[PDB]
Q: What sequence folds into this?
């Protein structure tokens, strides 16, 4: 209320600028050679969701 | 009036210009007034501070009300 | 992102973003081939074309930009492959 | 790309003006410059006689200003030449940043 | 060492209290105009060098090292006749040390005009008397007519080959016009609105011609600095700060007086010795504004052992301005006093720049609320932040001079402000 | 309904904020310095048919000049009547002021 | 104090106004100080001279005459006349007692000085008395600070001749009312410290520093 | 790493006029060197760098002023935010226009300007086209702590062209400079000091000068507005055509 400094509170404009840098063939062949192996944890995790029958057990039917 | 003759074709109910030019100017103490609106600062216009240095009444632009110095 | 390492570099031709939803602005020729990838792939399984958003930039040379959204119900991620094709 | 664009014939013989809107003289701020806009003259606007409001007949009334703004005279000219309009590009008049300093207000008028 | 003791033969401003004749036949007896012909003949570079060697700092609020300031003036004259505006105008609250040089030995001020003029290659001196000093500028015009009739000033500087004439301008009641970059304009005829610093007065000041604005006390000790020893002058005060400031013990002292005394003097020693003592004893002291009004307070717990020199008072989170020490005892409403100071800075603010023009009326409104207690405990942090919004941004240091009293009041007597606010709260409900 | 100040004088100073905020561009406002000198709208015509009743005009208006009266019962036999004229039919809010002033006095807390 | 002009029969740009004799010479001298051009520099002294000549206030005709004498557009003279505080633009009577009001006076009873002076005279703050003689006007720091409470009179009775801007300092309510009565009786009270036992700007018990006879120090 | 920096062309395509290609001073605007001729104020050294520094009284045609401090960029080694409008670019000077000190200085000043300023934006003729509104909505703070009695000023009669509401006017002095310099008639003035500052003729004096209707475009605030265009329209309704004029042969 009495501390109206804005640039700290700002959200619209208080963001890092877009860093659009070009990759040339050298960079990507370097990256492909650097990627030696796809060990586990270099793989996207699965969104695990199984179904399970439940009648009214959550809270006892009372929420 | 003539401006008020553009939107009002009734010409029997008093034109708003006259309804505001017939209300007396409000005496006050200082050199600046508030005129927040009718009475409730949230149901009137944005508060408009008027200067009363002149002798003639200084109208509030938003509400037409008039204020005089009352020294 | 895993998807950029495996993907043939040529397929993500022009651009690539890294926030507000990641995108692979590709070329129109490699598009359905790129859409063949990210689907029918074990570690990138989208299977769900959410949306195909035409976007028109008159000041570009390739006016339109056919923004293919893609959801991955398996890995719970969303990729936005784009293109660029003018009026003809 | 004028014929495939579905625009009616009578609106592809239109004469446009590819200007760059000058800065609004009232406000000294350049945040709306450099956005070249085609200007379909679209002068024909009468007054619908029932109510006081106006009433255009040209389809290209507003889109010249609204939502159709390029970023360079080359892109705007390429656009107005694809569609087959007779564009007359009106160059933007830009300001000279003439050198000026504070200490010139307190200049000495010799004697 | 241990400073403070200045013997009556070491006070530069003799006839301060107007006991003896101020004009000629009364000034030559006090050594004024003694051998200025030799000094002018000793040259300009020698004068600047001896002023720098004497370590004389600015007697005015700026505190800049004089002499070094006089070396800023151009050496080769490119057609612009270098001027010398003397800042006689003070208008700082508390400051009468100028009022005792314009009258009561003004010939020191005129001889200083001449010696600094030959010092900084000047060609005319415009003693900008404060507007209200009507009797003072009448005495000074009398002494100027004298020094003109005695061949001291005008077409030959005291018989020497230097053409130097002193003209006496006088403003009209404006503390703002007193500023260095605003003196030049208020004297140029325009309003007393400061100019921005990128054109410095030494480069393009009065009439665009180069000039340096000097307070009367700095320009007026210049003669006796040169005639006596620059080593003798620098033998007073601490290492950097050196000289004999002319103080003005202003308020709430049982014997208020302006008295010349060595710099680096303990503030308590000055109070207890010369002006008597803080009304009701030193234990009755509440706060002290050590400089003029452009300086934060001293809450009496760092006022016992603080020295009235630029460096120490700057190190105590305050400033030594015109050294117009304003003393306030436990009986005053210190928040009301600082509210009246902020009202002063609201009144005497030429309004040229937005941070001061508006924020000073704002500071006055917040102070006239907090002196009753109408504020909220977080406004004391708005007031600090408002002052820090005013401080660095204004054209001249008046923005500072208006943010500093309130900043010091907050920093020191925040307990008292908070107490007034809480007492207002409990008064309600 | 275009509100009025208790002492006559249409509350609608012609800022054109509601004409700007209107999503459907229903409100057409033309302004003229009246002889009294205080700005007012020579033409304040809301086109109710071209209007989405979203209350943006009530929010955007600075002085609460335009408000939506709880009427909602104004089905008109002919379309031309449904176009609410320049400050004459929206000036019928004076009848609805007794309810509009109540709703505003109770909503202004939000 | 308005920062603009409201015409009046006493004060309007129609009225002819020009520096009287015994003041044209002062005008010529004041203009002689400053160079041929840049004579605008002399707007403060010329305006103060016009204020002294017209009995204490600056009519618009006076500012126009100063502008003609000084050769700038009258707006620049108007700008300087409204800026500087000493220039009264409405009549302040014959004396215009200026009582300082800054902190070094406020803490030393200057509010009581002003209140006593006001209730004795009977004017709000700056209104001129029905007698047309006196008027009170607050002024910021007047320099007279160690002389703790002060009151400056601006004798506008004669005009540019008997114009005395006296400093009555170290005053008290009784001293102030005495000064005002002795002023309305015609005579000129002795200015300076209204409190003996102290020399001007002195330590109130006899000065403690400047005692030895002045003499040329060892140069 | 093979980045793509934006072009960073001047602020409005402003042609930069070197008096000679030798005295080009090189200053750093946000760590991006720009070559500006000798004598360019920091504001122009930034308008060469595409950085648009918010200015209230600095007009390129008019003289340079410090009547407000809305620009206050922070140069590298100065103790206080320098007003960009008057600080001449020195070679090697590092201008940081968006550093927290610069942004806090801008917010500070835009609070002072909106402090004694009346809430006339709805009834202000220049409501949409306003430097004060568009600098508050872009560089000034989102909230105002001033809750007291704003100062108010009577409306001066400046003729049948310039409607004047000096309460809105921020006393940036731009018009009193335009009438003294470009219009050259010298009728407007900054009468008084402090917040009591009032812009206009001290005696009722219609601006007899032609070319003095442009003070409205000069004015960064509604205060000075076209009385003929009293309120008839808004900054957004007006469809603009870049036509020419035929009244006088200057074209
Ligand atoms: C806020 C402020 C207050 C000032 N007060 C005074 C003053 O009381 N007396 C004075 O002679 N000059 C005053 N000046 C002007 C200069 O700061 C400085 O005192 C003068 O130009 C040169 O004095 P010096 O040579 O002793 O440093 C003031 C300037 C500012 C910005
Ligand atoms: S507003 Fe303050 S800093 Fe700016 S010129 Fe006036 S007194 Fe100086
Ligand atoms: S509710 Fe109001 S703003 Fe919205 S469309 Fe209807 S008239 Fe326009
Ligand atoms: S109804 Fe509200 S927004 Fe529309 S013109 Fe009137 S005051 Fe402005
Ligand atoms: S100039 Fe007018 S529109 Fe702009 S902020 Fe001030 S009152 Fe509002
Ligand atoms: S009237 Fe307009 S141009 Fe003149 S000072 Fe005020 S805001 Fe600036
Ligand atoms: S207190 Fe400052 S002069 Fe009287
Ligand atoms: S416009 Fe450059 S600081 Fe005021
Ligand atoms: Zn109102």
A:
């Amino acid at each position: 209320v009495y501390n109206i400094v804005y640039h700290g509170r700002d959200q619209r404009r208080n963001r890092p600028p877009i860093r659009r840098y070009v990759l040339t063939k050298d960079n990507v062949v370097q990256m492909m050679n650097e990627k030696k192996s796809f060990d586990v944890s270099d793989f996207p995790k699965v969104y695990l969701t199984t179904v399970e029958e439940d009648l009214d057990t959550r809270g006892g039917g009372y929420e | 009036g003539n401006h008020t003759a553009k939107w009002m074709q009734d010409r029997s109910k008093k034109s708003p210009m006259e309804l505001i030019s017939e209300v007396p100017p409000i005496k006050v103490d200082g050199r600046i007034v508030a005129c927040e609106g009718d009475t409730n600062p949230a149901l009137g216009h944005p508060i408009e501070f008027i200067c009363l240095d002149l002798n003639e009444p200084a109208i509030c632009k938003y509400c037409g009300l008039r204020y005089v110095q009352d020294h | 992102k895993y998807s950029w390492e495996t993907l043939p570099k040529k397929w993500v031709k022009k651009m690539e973003r890294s926030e507000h939803g990641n995108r692979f602005d590709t070329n129109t020729d490699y598009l359905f081939q790129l859409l063949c990838f990210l689907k029918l792939h074990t570690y990138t399984r989208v299977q769900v074309l959410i949306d195909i958003c035409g976007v028109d930039y008159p000041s570009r040379k390739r006016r339109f930009e056919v923004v293919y959204n893609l959801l991955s119900t398996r890995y719970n991620s969303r990729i936005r492959v784009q293109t660029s094709a003018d009026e003809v | 790309i004028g014929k495939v664009s579905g625009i009616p014939e009578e609106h592809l013989s239109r004469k446009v003006i590819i200007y760059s809107p000058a800065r609004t003289a009232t406000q000294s701020g350049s945040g709306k410059l450099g956005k070249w806009k085609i200007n379909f003259v679209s002068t024909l606007k009468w007054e619908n006689p029932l109510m006081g409001w106006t009433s255009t007949g040209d389809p290209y009334a507003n889109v010249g200003d609204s939502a159709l703004a390029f970023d360079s005279e080359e892109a705007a000219k390429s656009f107005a030449e694809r569609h087959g309009w007779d564009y007359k590009v009106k160059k933007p008049n830009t300001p000279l940043l003439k050198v000026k300093s504070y200490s010139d207000n307190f200049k000495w008028k010799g004697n | 060492t241990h400073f403070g003791g200045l013997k009556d033969e070491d006070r530069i401003f003799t006839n301060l209290y107007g006991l003896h004749d101020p004009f000629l036949k009364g000034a030559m007896k006090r050594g004024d105009w003694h051998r200025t012909k030799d000094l002018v003949l000793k040259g300009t570079d020698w004068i600047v060098n001896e002023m720098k060697k004497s370590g004389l700092r600015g007697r005015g609020g700026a505190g800049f090292p004089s002499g070094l300031k006089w070396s800023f003036m151009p050496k080769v004259s490119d057609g612009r006749p270098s001027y010398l505006v003397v800042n006689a105008d003070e208008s700082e609250p508390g400051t009468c040390k100028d009022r005792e040089i314009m009258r009561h030995d003004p010939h020191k001020l005129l001889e200083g005009c001449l010696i600094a003029g030959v010092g900084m290659r000047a060609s005319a001196a415009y003693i900008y008397i404060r507007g209200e000093y009507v009797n003072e500028r009448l005495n000074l015009e009398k002494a100027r007519r004298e020094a003109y009739a005695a061949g001291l000033l005008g077409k030959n500087a005291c018989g020497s080959g230097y053409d130097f004439e002193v003209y006496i301008h006088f403003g009209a009641g404006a503390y703002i016009c007193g500023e260095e970059t605003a003196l030049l304009e208020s004297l140029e005829g325009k309003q007393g609105k400061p100019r921005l610093k990128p054109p410095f007065p030494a480069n393009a000041g009065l009439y665009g011609c180069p000039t340096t604005v000097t307070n009367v006390e700095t320009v007026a000790v210049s003669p006796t600095i040169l005639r006596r020893g620059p080593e003798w002058f620098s033998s007073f005060g601490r290492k950097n700060n050196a000289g004999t400031k002319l103080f003005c013990i202003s308020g709430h002292v049982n014997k208020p007086c302006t008295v010349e005394e060595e710099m680096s003097i303990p503030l308590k020693e000055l109070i207890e010795r010369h002006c008597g003592g803080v009304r009701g004893g030193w234990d009755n002291l509440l706060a002290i504004i050590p400089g003029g009004s452009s300086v934060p307070l001293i809450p009496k717990n760092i006022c016992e052992d603080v020295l009235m020199d630029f460096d120490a008072l700057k190190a105590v989170q305050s400033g030594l301005g015109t050294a117009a020490v304003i003393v306030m005892d436990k009986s005053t409403d210190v928040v009301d006093a600082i509210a009246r100071l902020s009202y002063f800075y609201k009144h005497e603010s030429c309004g040229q720049c937005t941070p001061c023009r508006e924020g000073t009326g704002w500071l006055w409104m917040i102070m006239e609320r907090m002196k009753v207690g109408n504020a909220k405990l977080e406004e004391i942090d708005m007031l600090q932040e408002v002052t820090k919004q005013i401080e660095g941004h204004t054209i001249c240091a008046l923005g500072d001079a208006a943010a500093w009293p309130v900043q010091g009041l907050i920093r020191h007597f925040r307990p008292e402000l908070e107490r007034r606010i809480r007492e207002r709260a409990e008064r309600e409900l | 309904a275009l509100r009025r100040y208790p002492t006559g004088e249409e509350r609608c100073i012609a800022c054109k904020l509601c004409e700007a905020v209107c999503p459907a561009q229903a409100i057409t406002i033309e302004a003229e310095e009246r002889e009294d000198g205080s700005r007012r709208t020579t033409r304040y015509d809301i086109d109710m048919t071209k209007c989405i009743y979203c209350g943006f005009c009530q929010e955007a208006c600075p002085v609460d000049a335009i408000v939506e009266g709880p009427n909602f019962e104004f089905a008109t036999e002919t379309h031309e009547e449904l176009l609410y004229d320049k400050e004459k039919l929206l000036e019928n809010g004076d009848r609805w002021e007794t309810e509009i002033a109540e709703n505003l006095r109770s909503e202004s807390l939000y | 104090a308005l920062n603009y002009h409201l015409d009046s029969p006493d004060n309007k740009p129609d009225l002819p106004w020009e520096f009287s004799e015994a003041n044209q010479s002062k005008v010529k001298e004041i203009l002689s100080y400053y160079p041929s051009n840049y004579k605008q520099s002399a707007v403060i002294p010329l305006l103060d001279l016009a204020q002294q000549q017209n009995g204490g206030w600056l009519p618009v005709s006076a500012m126009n005459a100063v502008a003609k004498v000084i050769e700038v557009a009258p707006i620049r003279v108007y700008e300087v006349a409204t800026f500087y505080s000493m220039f009264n633009r409405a009549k302040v009577g014959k004396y215009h007692l200026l009582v300082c009001g800054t902190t070094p006076c406020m803490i030393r009873g200057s509010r009581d000085i002003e209140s006593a002076l006001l209730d004795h005279l009977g004017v709000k703050r700056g209104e001129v008395t029905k007698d047309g003689l006196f008027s009170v006007g607050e002024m910021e720091c007047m320099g007279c600070c160690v002389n703790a409470p002060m009151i400056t009179v601006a004798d506008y009775s004669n005009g540019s001749e008997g114009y005395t801007y006296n400093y009555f300092e170290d005053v008290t309510p009784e001293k102030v009312v005495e000064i005002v009565e002795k002023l309305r009786k015609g005579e000129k009270p002795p200015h300076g410290t209204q409190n003996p036992k102290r020399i001007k700007c002195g330590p109130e018990g006899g000065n403690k520093t400047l005692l030895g006879e002045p003499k040329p120090p060892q140069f | 790493p093979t980045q793509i920096l934006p072009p960073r062309n001047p602020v409005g395509g402003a042609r930069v006029h070197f008096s000679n290609p030798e005295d080009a001073i090189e200053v750093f605007v946000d760590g991006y060197a720009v070559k500006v001729p000798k004598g360019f104020t920091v504001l122009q050294a930034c308008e060469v760098a595409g950085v648009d520094i918010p200015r209230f009284c600095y007009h390129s045609r008019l003289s340079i002023a410090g009547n407000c401090r809305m620009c206050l960029v922070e140069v590298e080694k100065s103790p206080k935010p320098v007003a960009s409008c008057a600080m001449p670019a020195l070679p090697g000077m590092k201008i940081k226009t968006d550093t927290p000190i610069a942004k806090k200085a801008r917010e500070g000043v835009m609070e002072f300007l909106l402090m004694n300023h009346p809430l006339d934006c709805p009834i202000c003729d220049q409501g949409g086209e306003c430097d004060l509104q568009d600098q508050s909505m872009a560089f000034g703070s989102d909230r105002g702590r001033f809750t007291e009695m704003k100062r108010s000023v009577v409306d001066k009669n400046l003729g049948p062209l310039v409607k004047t509401v000096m309460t809105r006017c921020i006393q940036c002095t731009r018009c009193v400079r335009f009438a003294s310099e470009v219009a050259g008639v010298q009728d407007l003035g900054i009468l008084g000091r402090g917040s009591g500052e009032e812009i206009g003729t001290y005696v009722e004096k219609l601006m007899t000068s032609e070319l003095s209707g442009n003070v409205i475009d000069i004015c960064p605030v509604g205060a000075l507005t076209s009385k003929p265009f009293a309120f008839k329209a808004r900054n957004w309704e007006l469809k603009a055509t870049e036509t020419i004029d035929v009244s006088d042969a200057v074209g």
